[PDB]
Amino acid sequence: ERPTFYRQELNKTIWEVPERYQNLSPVGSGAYGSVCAAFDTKTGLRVAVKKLSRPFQSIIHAKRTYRELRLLKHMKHENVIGLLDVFTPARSLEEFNDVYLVTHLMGADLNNIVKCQKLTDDHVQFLIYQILRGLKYIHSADIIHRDLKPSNLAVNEDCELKILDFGLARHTDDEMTGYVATRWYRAPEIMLNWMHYNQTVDIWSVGCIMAELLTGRTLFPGTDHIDQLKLILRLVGTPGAELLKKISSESARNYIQSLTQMPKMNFANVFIGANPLAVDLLEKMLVLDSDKRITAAQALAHAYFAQYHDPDDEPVADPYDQSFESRDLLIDEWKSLTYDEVISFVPP
Numbered sequence: 652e653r654p655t656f657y658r659q660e661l662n663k664t665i666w667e668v669p670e671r672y673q674n675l676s677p678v679g680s681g682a683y684g685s686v687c688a689a690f691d692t693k694t695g696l697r698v699a700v701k702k703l704s705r706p707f708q709s710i711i712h713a714k715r716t717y718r719e720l721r722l723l724k725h726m727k728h729e730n731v732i733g734l735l736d737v738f739t740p741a742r743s744l745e746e747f748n749d750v751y752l753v754t755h756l757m758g759a760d761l762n763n764i765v766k767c768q769k770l771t772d773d774h775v776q777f778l779i780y781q782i783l784r785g786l787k788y789i790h791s792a793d794i795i796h797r798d799l800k801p802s803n804l805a806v807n808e809d810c811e812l813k814i815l816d817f818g819l820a821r822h823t824d825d826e827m828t829g830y831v832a833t834r835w836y837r838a839p840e841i842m843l844n845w846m847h848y849n850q851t852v853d854i855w856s857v858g859c860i861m862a863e864l865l866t867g868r869t870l871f872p873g874t875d876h877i878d879q880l881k882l883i884l885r886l887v888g889t890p891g892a893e894l895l896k897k898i899s900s901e902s903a904r905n906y907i908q909s910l911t912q913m914p915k916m917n918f919a920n921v922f923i924g925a926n927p928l929a930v931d932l933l934e935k936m937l938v939l940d941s942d943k944r945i946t947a948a949q950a951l952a953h954a955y956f957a958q959y960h961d962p963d964d965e966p967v968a969d970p971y972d973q974s975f976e977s978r979d980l981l982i983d984e985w986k987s988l989t990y991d992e993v994i995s996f997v998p999p
C-alpha cells in the first residue's frame with residue numbers, strides 16, 4: 652500500500668516523489684544534494700524536500716547518510732529541525748539508491764533576518780533562548796552540533812527558530828582557510844585541534860552569535876586561523892597554566908607560550924550600551940577553557956532569559972545510541988542499515 656510516485660526532471664536530476672508532494676520548485680543546490688520547496692497535500696504544510704546525491708558511493712558516504720538519517724529521525728523538538736517524512740521510490744533493498752528527506756519550510760536563515768531588520772534586546776533575548784533550548788535538547792542526548800553558525804539557524808515570519816545541519820559532511824581544510832564565516836564561529840580548541848573537544852564547543856558558537864546580533868558585527872572575523880586566534884585572545888586573555896596542561900598538541904601548547912600574555916578585556920567596555928545581563932551571559936559563554944564554560948541548561952536559568960525561561964517547558968531528549976560511530980562496516984551494510992531506517996519511519 653505504498654504511495655504512487657511521479658517522476659520529473661529537476662536540478663538536472665530526476666526526482667521521483669509521492670503524489671502528495673506537488674509544485675516542486677528547486678530552491679538551491681550543492682555537493683550536499685539538491686533541495687526543493689513543495690506543497691504537501693496531506694498536511695497542508697509548505698515543506699522542503701532534500702534529495703541526497705550518490706548517498707552510497709563510498710564507505711565514508713554510506714556511513715555519512717546513515718548518520719544524517721539517524722540524527723534527523725531522533726530530533727523531536729520545537730527548536731530543532733525535525734523530520735516530517737523520508738522515502739525512496741525503491742520497492743526492494745536491491746533497487747535502493749536514492750534517499751529523500753522532507754522537513755518544514757522555514758524560508759530563511761539568521762543572516763537574512765538580521766540584514767533587513769533591527770534586533771532589539773528583546774529580539775536577541777528570544778532568538779538565543781530558542782537556540783539554547785534546542786541545544787539543551789541536543790546535548791542531553793550526547794549529540795554535539797559542531798558547527799553552529801547563523802546560516803544553520805532557520806527563522807520564520809514569527810521569529811520561531813530551528814537548528815539545522817546535522818550529520819552533514821565535515822568541512823574541508825580549503826573550506827576553513829582565510830577570511831571566511833565558516834571558521835569565525837568555531838571554538839579555538841577545535842579550530843586549532845588543541846584537545847578532544849566536547850559539547851561546549853557549541854556554547855562558544857552561541858556567544859559569537861549573540862554578540863553579533865547585539866553589535867551587528869562579526870565578533871572574531873579573522874583573516875586566517877592565526878589572525879583569528881589573536882582576535883580571540885585579545886578579548887578573553889591568553890591561556891592560564893591550567894588550560895595549557897589540557898592542550899595535547901605540544902606544538903600548539905608551544906605556540907601559545909610564544910604569544911605575549913594578555914589579560915581578559917572588560918566586556919562592558921567592549922559591548923557598550925548592551926543590557927548588563929547580556930554582557931554577563933556573554934562572559935560566562937566566551938571562556939577559553941571549555942571546562943569552565945557555561946552549559947546550555949545553566950544558561951537557560953540565567954536572569955537574562957527570565958522573560959522566557961520555564962523549567963517545565965525545556966525538554967530533554969530520549970537516549971540516542973550512537974555506538975554505530977565506532978562500528979566498522981562495508982558499504983552494503985551501512986546501506987542496508989539506512990534502508991531499514993527509511994522503511995521503519997513513523998510520520999509524526
Ligand SMILES: O=C1NCc2c(-c3ccc(F)cc3F)cc(N3CCNCC3)cc2N1c1c(Cl)cccc1Cl
Pocket residue numbers: 678679681683686687699700701723732734752753754755756757758759760802803804805806815816
Ligand atoms: O526552510 C528550510 N527548511 C529545510 C532546509 C534544509 C533541510 C534540512 C533537513 C532535511 F531533511 C531537508 C531539508 F531540506 C536544508 C537547508 N540548507 C541548504 C543546504 N545548506 C544548509 C541549509 C535549508 C533549509 N531551509 C531553509 C531554506 Cl529552503 C531557505 C533558507 C533558509 C533555510 Cl534554513
